[PDB]
Amino acid sequence: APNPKAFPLADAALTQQILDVVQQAANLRQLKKGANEATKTLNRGISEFIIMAADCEPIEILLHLPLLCEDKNVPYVFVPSRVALGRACGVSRPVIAASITTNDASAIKTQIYAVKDKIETLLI
Amino acid sequence: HPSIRYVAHPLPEKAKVSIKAYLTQHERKRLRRNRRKMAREAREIKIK
Amino acid sequence: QNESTADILKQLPHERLQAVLEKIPEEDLEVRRLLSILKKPEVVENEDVQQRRIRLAEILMVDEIDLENIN
């Protein structure tokens, strides 16, 4: 298992859907990669939801975020592989945390609310 | 009738999903450039 | 004559790949299954079936391994 600590962690199918939204919003410029820009989106409050990586090491550097996500009441999930995550973000270098941000004019908004809803299902 | 002496630990009972691998605009441009380079050199050397 | 057109043409990298594309059967589950076993990415961002077959060909070309060698 990808660490005992990191929670929640989606399955292969929902991971596939979430990564699909990652690539899509990445094509719509509605995504912000990286832990620092994820943190910036959380502080600004424009973040729809946070994706993070399970296989990353060390895990703590991604474990600073869940506290901030629970503070701002924003959903977050853990895709298993940072290589697949950044690969979906469109960067060869593996990305650990990505953030789907808010756009009122976005065409994928409904997709973001559906995936976000399933994320809130996972959160517990 | 049941056994008090011991404690059972039975049946740790337990779906393939196609992995879609996206990739960069750099590897899309590089990929198309390589494919069209193969077809282009194939038609050029072939017609040569 | 020396360096026959068949030898140069088969030596050409694209056509040498096209000869391998003729050796691979075209099926969704079989083409997909060979990628799954081969550990290469099973599906890429957006591809037609023929393009997935082309990825088969390319991967068999770069790795220098054939279908009979895999299975």
Swiss-Prot record, chain A:
Q: Where in the cell is it found?
A: Nucleus, Nucleolus
Q: Provide the primary localization.
A: nucleus
What Gene3D superfamilies does its record include?
3.30.1330.30
Q: Quick one: signal sequence residues?
A: none
- UniProt keyword terms in alphabetical order: mRNA processing, mRNA splicing, Nucleus, Ribonucleoprotein, Ribosome biogenesis, RNA-binding, rRNA processing, Spliceosome
Listed GO biological process terms: box C/D sno(s)RNA 3'-end processing; maturation of SSU-rRNA; maturation of SSU-rRNA from tricistronic rRNA transcript (SSU-rRNA, 5.8S rRNA, LSU-rRNA); mRNA splicing, via spliceosome; snoRNA guided rRNA 2'-O-methylation; spliceosomal complex assembly
Q: Which domain of life is it from?
A: Eukaryota
List the CDD domains: SNU13
Q: Which GO terms describe its molecular function?
A: RNA binding; U3 snoRNA binding; U4 snRNA binding
GO cellular component terms, alphabetically, are:
box C/D methylation guide snoRNP complex; nucleolus; nucleoplasm; nucleus; precatalytic spliceosome; small-subunit processome; spliceosomal complex; U4 snRNP
Question: Record keywords: RNA-binding included?
Answer: yes
Q: Does the keyword RNA-binding apply?
A: yes
- Disulphide-bonded residues: none
Stated family = Belongs to the eukaryotic ribosomal protein eL8 family.
State the protein's purpose: Common component of the spliceosome and rRNA processing machinery. In association with the spliceosomal U4/U6.U5 tri-snRNP particle, required for splicing of pre-mRNA. In association with box C/D snoRNPs, required for processing of pre-ribosomal RNA (rRNA) and site-specific 2'-O-methylation of substrate RNAs. Essential for the accumulation and stability of U4 snRNA, U6 snRNA, and box C/D snoRNAs.
Q: How does it assemble?
A: Binds to the C'/D and B/C motifs in U3 snoRNA. Component of the U4/U6-U5 tri-snRNP complex composed of the U4, U6 and U5 snRNAs and at least PRP3, PRP4, PRP6, PRP8, PRP18, PRP31, PRP38, SNU13, SNU23, SNU66, SNU114, SPP381, SMB1, SMD1, SMD2, SMD3, SMX2, SMX3, LSM2, LSM3, LSM4, LSM5, LSM6, LSM7, LSM8, BRR2 and DIB1. Binds to the 5'-stem-loop of U4 snRNA. Component of the ribosomal small subunit (SSU) processome composed of at least 40 protein subunits and snoRNA U3.
- What is the protein name stated in its UniProt record? 13 kDa ribonucleoprotein-associated protein
Q: What is the lineage of its organism?
A: Eukaryota, Fungi, Dikarya, Ascomycota, Saccharomycotina
The gene coding this protein: SNU13
Swiss-Prot record, chain B:
Q: What else is known?
A: Present with 432 molecules/cell in log phase SD medium.
Per the record, the coiled-coil ranges are none
Q: Where in the cell is it found?
A: Nucleus
- The identity of this protein, by name, is U4/U6 small nuclear ribonucleoprotein PRP3
Q: Which organism is it from?
A: Saccharomyces cerevisiae (strain ATCC 204508 / S288c)
Record's subunit section: Component of the U4/U6-U5 tri-snRNP complex composed of the U4, U6 and U5 snRNAs and at least PRP3, PRP4, PRP6, PRP8, PRP18, PRP31, PRP38, SNU13, SNU23, SNU66, SNU114, SPP381, SMB1, SMD1, SMD2, SMD3, SMX2, SMX3, LSM2, LSM3, LSM4, LSM5, LSM6, LSM7, LSM8, BRR2 and DIB1.
Q: Which domain of life is it from?
A: Eukaryota
Chain's role: Participates in pre-mRNA splicing. Part of the U4/U5/U6 tri-snRNP complex, one of the building blocks of the spliceosome.
User: Which gene is annotated as encoding this protein in its UniProt record?
Assistant: PRP3
From Swiss-Prot, chain C:
Q: Give the residues annotated as coiled coil.
A: none
Cystine connections: none
Which range is the signal sequence, renumbered to this chain?
none
- State which residue ranges cross the membrane: none
Q: Where in the cell is it found?
A: Nucleus
Assembly and binders: Component of the U4/U6-U5 tri-snRNP complex composed of the U4, U6 and U5 snRNAs and at least PRP3, PRP4, PRP6, PRP8, PRP18, PRP31, PRP38, SNU13, SNU23, SNU66, SNU114, SPP381, SMB1, SMD1, SMD2, SMD3, SMX2, SMX3, LSM2, LSM3, LSM4, LSM5, LSM6, LSM7, LSM8, BRR2 and DIB1.
Its annotated function is as follows:
Involved in RNA splicing. Is required for the association of U4/U6 snRNP with U5 snRNP in an early step of spliceosome assembly.
The extra comment attached to this record reads: Present with 1770 molecules/cell in log phase SD medium.
- Protein name as annotated: U4/U6 small nuclear ribonucleoprotein PRP4
Which species is this UniProt entry from? Saccharomyces cerevisiae (strain ATCC 204508 / S288c)
